[PDB]
Structure formats: C-alpha cells, structure tokens
Symmetry: none
C-alpha cells in the first residue's frame, strides 16, 4: 500500500497531468519513466526529477516504440510495476489517447506478468485517463457524461481480462463541470497514487 520502490511508466510524461503524476510519484519514493515524443522536453524534465526518473523517447501509438521504452525501463530500474496513460490528453474516435492506451496495455501486461505477485497477489497496476468529449450544449442522457466512452467502456472488460495475471485496471474520468472556474494536475496525481495504494480498486471508473 505504498508507491515507494515501485517503477511507473507514464505516457505523456513530459508535461501536463503526466509530468504532475511523475513529480508526485518520484517525490513519494517511486521511480518513473517519462514516455513521450522526442523533443517534447521529456529529456530535460527527466533530468530535473533526479536519478529516480528517466526519459524514454517514443510515440505511444507505435508498438515498436513502446517496446523500446519498456526495455529501457527494465534496463534502468529492473521492472515495470505501474503504467499511467496520460498521452494525448485517425482523429476523434481513434485518437492518440485511445490508441496509445490500448498499445501500452497490450504490451505492458506481458511485462507485468513476469513480476512476482505481492501479498494480495498483484503483479501490476494500470491507470487510464478517459478522453474528454467537449460539452456541445446537448440535453438529455448525453449531458450526463464528459468522456468519449471508448476507454471508459473498456475498463471493466480489460480488468477482467488481466485478472489472472494479477493486474488491476482503473480509469480516471473528467467530472461534468470543467472545475475551470475560469477561462487540477495535483488532484489528478494524488488520485493516481491513491489508486496504486488501494489494492481493492479494480475495473472501475472514477470521476475527478
């Protein structure tokens, strides 16, 4: 129930929610691999975060690039315990977020499978970020959700699919109110840590 010692791969880690999650986790004793595009500024950020953080240049929509990134993570920290998908947050449906997430989940599951189970039998934790569907003034049922639905709808199924390997799968979705109060990373990061530390949360979607 502690992130200390865990190795986390964070897509879109050079900035935004990804960077905020990395800073939080590293500050809590974990190791982080910032997986992001070359020239994204991930190299500088990984450097600033200390020797418990490395930069893995890669495009999340590329299976081969993600394999190289996971190999780097294993080469530098020994293994992969957690994957946090924060990248990208054709065009609207199969966007970078959905494609990168599915690509990461399919590849990291095999890696996490090699890990030895813990007390509760968990080998890994995967945390996804739902894609936001901008409010367009719709009325009725559609108004009750702020996410596209692709990643959210796949959460329970994927959690059930990886249960035998002891891999928990959770998704963080947006709330209905932008909470912009004008025109929060910390909150998102704290939720990531909380999900990682509670072995009882699995196959669920939590709105921030």
């Amino acid at each position: 129930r502690s992130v200390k010692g865990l190795v986390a791969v964070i897509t879109g880690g050079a900035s935004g929610l990804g960077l905020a999650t990395a800073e939080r986790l590293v500050g809590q004793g974990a190791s982080a691999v910032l997986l992001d595009l070359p020239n994204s500024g991930g190299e500088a950020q990984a450097k600033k975060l200390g020797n418990n953080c490395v930069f893995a240049p890669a495009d999340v929509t590329s299976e081969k690039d993600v394999q190289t990134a996971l190999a780097l993570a294993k080469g530098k920290f020994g293994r992969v315990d957690v994957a946090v998908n924060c990248a990208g947050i054709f065009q609207r449906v199969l966007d970078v977020n959905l494609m990168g997430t599915f690509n990461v989940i399919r590849l990291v599951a095999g890696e996490m499978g090699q890990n030895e189970p813990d007390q509760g039998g968990q080998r890994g934790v995967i945390i996804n970020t739902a894609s936001v569907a901008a409010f367009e003034g719709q009325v009725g049922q559609a108004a009750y959700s702020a996410s596209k639905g692709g990643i959210v709808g796949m959460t329970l199924p994927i959690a059930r699919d990886l249960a035998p390997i002891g891999i928990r799968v959770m998704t963080i979705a947006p709330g209905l109110f932008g909470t912009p109060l004008l025109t929060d990373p910390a909150e998102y990061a704290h939720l990531v840590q909380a999900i990682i530390e509670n072995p009882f949360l699995n196959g669920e979607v939590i709105r921030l």
Copy 2:
C-alpha cells in the same frame, strides 16, 4: 457561504414566492432587485423593503426589458450576484416561466461573467422554479412528476454550459403532494437562501 452583501435579481418579485424570497434575502443582509411588470405593485413593495431593494419594471419575456432591469441593478447596487426566476408561477409549453427564465439566464450569465471569482471560484448563482403541471389523474410514470419538464430538463445542461464562468445553476421543483392540506413561500425562500450558501450544489433539481 453567506448571502450578506450579495445582489439578487428576482423575477416576479412583486408577489408570491418572488416577494417572499426578496423579503427573506433582504432580511438576511442581501440587496434585491424586484423585476416585475409595471403596475404589478412592485414599486410599493420595493419601497417597503428598504433602501436595499429596488423595483425594475419589466416583462421577463422581453430581452430588451431584462437588459434595462440588469442595467438598473448594476446602476443601483454595482453588480448582479444572484438571479432567482419566480415569474409566471404561446400558452402551455412556452409559458412565461420558461421563456422568462431562458431570457434571464442568457442575459445575466454575461453580467455575472464580469464578476471576480470568489474563494471557490464562483461568479454567480442562478436559481430556477419549475413550472407545475396540474395533476390530471394520470396513472403510471407520468404520476411521478409534478413539473412540466422544460426547465427541469435544462438544469444540468445549462449548469454544464456555464461552469467555465463559475456560475451555478439549480432548480426548485414542486413535490407530488400539493402540501395544500386545504383548498409555502417561507419554505421556498429558505431553500433559495440555502442553495445560495452551499457552493457544492450545482446542476441539480430539488423538490420542495
């Protein structure tokens, strides 16, 4: 979490729930603008409520009249913090209540937008009153609601639409039993104040 110092525009403020809401708010330290038709008796009521209350002669279904009323409110109290729609409570569907409410919401949002956010980031609060659909002896699902549905169904959508400006939108609906016990304004007024003082209530419909 206090209505003291707030400026509230109340449609249908010359009598009924509107007047009761004005008396309550003014008695609690807020300023009120009674927006009602000329010769509605709003001038006399505004006078009796004290120098923290003014009368804005206007027809809520008229955009130009409401603009004049909001300008008067800004000219007399400096700004508009709250809007309470109590007016009217073609014919049945697009009634005075629904049309006046939509007209007020569309216009006051821009005004409230100019306000500086508060601690929680709120710039304004809009409270609506659902139209009552008189019980006709229907059985089945229709028997479970006492409101027409137009304003009620638009509550969450409008709350989501104005979230970026920090404007909360809430609606007060009738209960299933007339609570007439024969053939309450105070209760309604107290609920208005409670909604204004609780920054956590947004996009919801509360039955009285």
Copy 3:
C-alpha cells in the same frame, strides 16, 4: 400520532385481517365500524368488541350499501377518520377487493373531506390491501411481485388526487414468500396502526 379517538371503517371486518385490525384498533382506543355482508358474523363480532364497535351490513361492491354504512358510522361515532380495505382478501381482475376498494375510496373521500384538519393538516387516512396473485412458477420479472397490480399501481395516483383534502393513501402488499412456513393477522394489524400514526407515510406500498 395516536389512534385513540379515531373512527375507522374496516371492510371485511367480520373475519381475517379485517377482524384482526378491528380488535387491534379498538384495543388501542379507537372506534371501529365492521363493514361486511349480512350473515357474515359481523353482528356477533361487533357485539363482542364492545360499545366502541358497530356492525354495518353491506356489500362493498355496492355504492348504495357503502353510503348506508358510512351514514351508520357517522350516526354512531360522529365521523369517519380512517378506512381500511380488507374485503375480498367479474372474476380475476375486477375482483371484490379492487371494486370494493375503489367504491370505498370514492365515497369516503367526500366524508373525510368534511373533517377539520389536524396539526399536520390531515383529514383522513385510507389503507388498502393489495390482491394476491398466486405464484404459478413464473421466472423472470413477474416473479418479483406477489400482487395483481391494480390497487398497487393506483396508490400513488390516488394519494396525489386526494392530497388537497389532506387524505393519506397507503397500501399493504404481500411479501414474495407466503411466510406460511406450513400448509400473520397480528403483523398486518400492527402495520395498519403504524401507518395511521405516522403522518409522513403517503402514496407508498409497503410489503408485509
């Protein structure tokens, strides 16, 4: 919140749940009018229950007979405060229970209307008994209910219809398990009293 002093008309009062309800209410200080068919044994039972109980010979499916019964109740105890429908508990749909209940409700509402409201504004209380639909081995949704549905489905609508007169309408339905444990009136009677003493219960169906 006390049945003491109240006058209750109980259909099917010569035996079964009706008699059990009468004994309980009279034992608690209320007055009861046993409304049942001539030669039902209601005359003897009314006699045995004491001077706070009278027998009103009548067929509940007959409007004229029920009018005579209510007139007797007013002539003997002054008024009608409560009506409990326990009679009959063409053929299957429009059975004695449903027809007697609707006939009693339509007639007693006018009588209860003449009563002066109480603290909470109530003039009367009407309690119905759902008709039992014998279990036939059905699977699926139909297995989740033990009542025919006619009286049960009319409960909320009738409660809303009589709200202005201050008359509460409640219905007692059977549970899914006969609770026969072999091949309870007291429980039913205690529930009747509890419904009468709680002014907050209205338009609801309670399974025994």
Copy 4:
C-alpha cells in the same frame, strides 16, 4: 428583538436626548430620521451620522410639517418602524413636548399601520418622553412624581387605542432625583433600544 434594519423617526433629534438616541440606534444598525427645526443643526448632525441618517426639517407642533417629515422618511428608507418623541425636553401644560408627541402619534400610527406585522404581530413602536415638572419644594403626594402628567397619563390609553394595529406605546419618565450630582443621554438611549427590543413592554411608564 433587534433594532438592526428598523427605521426610527426621532423628534428633537438635532441635540440632547434625541441626538444621543439617534447615535445609539444608528450605531446599532438602524436607520434614523432626525426631525427638528430648520437651523437646529440637524442637517450637520444627520450628515455626520452617515448614510443611514437623514434630516427632516420640521416643527413637531405642525401636522403638515410632520407629514412632510414622515413622507421624507418613507422616501429615503421605505417605512417608519419606530417613533421616539424627544422634542421640547401655549406655555406650561400644552407645551411643545405634549403637542408634538400627540401630533406625531396621531400621524405615525397611520403610517405604521401599513407595515406588515412581525412574528409577535407588531407593526411599530412609539416611545415618549414625559415632561419634567421642576421640583418646587412641595411636600406630600405631589413630591412623589417628577413629571407633569399629561403624556404619562395618556400612555396606557393610547397603547390600548393602538393595540389593534400592533403598535406598542411606552413612556420614559424622570426619576425623583435629578441624578445631576452637580449643578444621562447614554442611559436614556440604551433604555430606548431596550424598549424597542422587548416586545413584552407595552402601555407602561418607566422611570430613568
């Protein structure tokens, strides 16, 4: 039971007990109208007391002047809740104090009548000041009073006369010892406030 929000008309408000009462009431959250002769210095005092105080130039013995003063009070603060007679404190019997008081009471009663009753049903409060009859060395019964008697003797009768309108009438009289201790406004002002805040005091004379 609070003077906050109340509008008080105070005769002889430019100085003495009148001014002291105004300062006290305004300091406590009420609004005050200083009713006094032109060039009495009431204009300057009203100015210094803030925007919750105005000066109504008028001679209390003139009905028309008092009407103009009450109209000003309604025009500036919306209504008249309290009247405090402190003016003048032919010649000895029908002095300015007695004549001004009767004139004010007769006129303000009608104004206070238009107010909506409060919890206890009060629409207004009128407080009078007895005229002092200077001690002349008399012995016997006459030595037991320090007031002329006109206003004091009319207190209960006037209180009974205005009871139906919900207007309380009280009078403050001098004590037998000048309490001069040499050759108190604050005390008098505090008593005025206390009378206004206690709805149980009516038709009585209280010696200071």
